[PDB]
Design a protein around this ligand. Sequence first.
Ligand code: ZJ3
Length: 168
Amino acid sequence: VNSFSGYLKLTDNVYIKNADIVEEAKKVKPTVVVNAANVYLKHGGGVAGALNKATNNAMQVESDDYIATNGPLKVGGSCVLSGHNLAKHCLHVVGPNVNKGEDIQLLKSAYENFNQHEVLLAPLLSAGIFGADPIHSLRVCVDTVRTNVYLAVFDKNLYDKLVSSFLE
Ligand SMILES: Nc1ncnc2c1ncn2[C@@H]1O[C@H](COP(=O)(O)OP(=O)(O)OC[C@H]2O[C@H](Oc3ccc4c(C(F)(F)F)cc(=O)oc4c3)[C@H](O)[C@@H]2O)[C@@H](O)[C@H]1O
């Protein structure tokens, strides 16, 4: 249905809201919801952990099946799997793990996957356990994605810092 509302428009195509991406998915019912994944699609926490939990582990079983057939993803790569009860499709995207020393330029490649989809509900890739600077991730998203991206930022403190950092 893609009935997004409450988002602050940052650019022609990038929108931001302070919300839980799970809550937004069940209110919006988007065509595509983005997961901030690892290369093994092991959904152990953060966005992935919340999305998986909202699918009742169904997302995890499907993801294991994908990994069993294709093997781990590449950092910066993606794969289109089922959205289950949250969306039509889930676009799993692997941002770089900057904490481990992975190349942050792979964050451009990660966001580039967004361009194959007309509208996405998405988180800030690599901005959590992967330790990428939140402002930088939003900048690469803005500089990279040309389709319509609705970013759900769970943390209010981070949301206010991104809005003022961008719209100011
Ligand atoms: N519900 C939400 N809705 C909207 N936005 C949200 C939401 N929740 C977070 N964000 C925000 O999204 C942005 C991205 O953060 P993420 O950490 O989800 O993604 P990432 O940085 O690209 O790293 C990718 C990895 O994370 C996941 O693995 C883990 C594993 C363990 C933990 C643990 C702990 F078990 F070790 F303790 C604590 C923890 O907090 O997170 C983990 C992530 C996933 O399997 C992948 O391997 C941040 O700005 C965050 O603040």
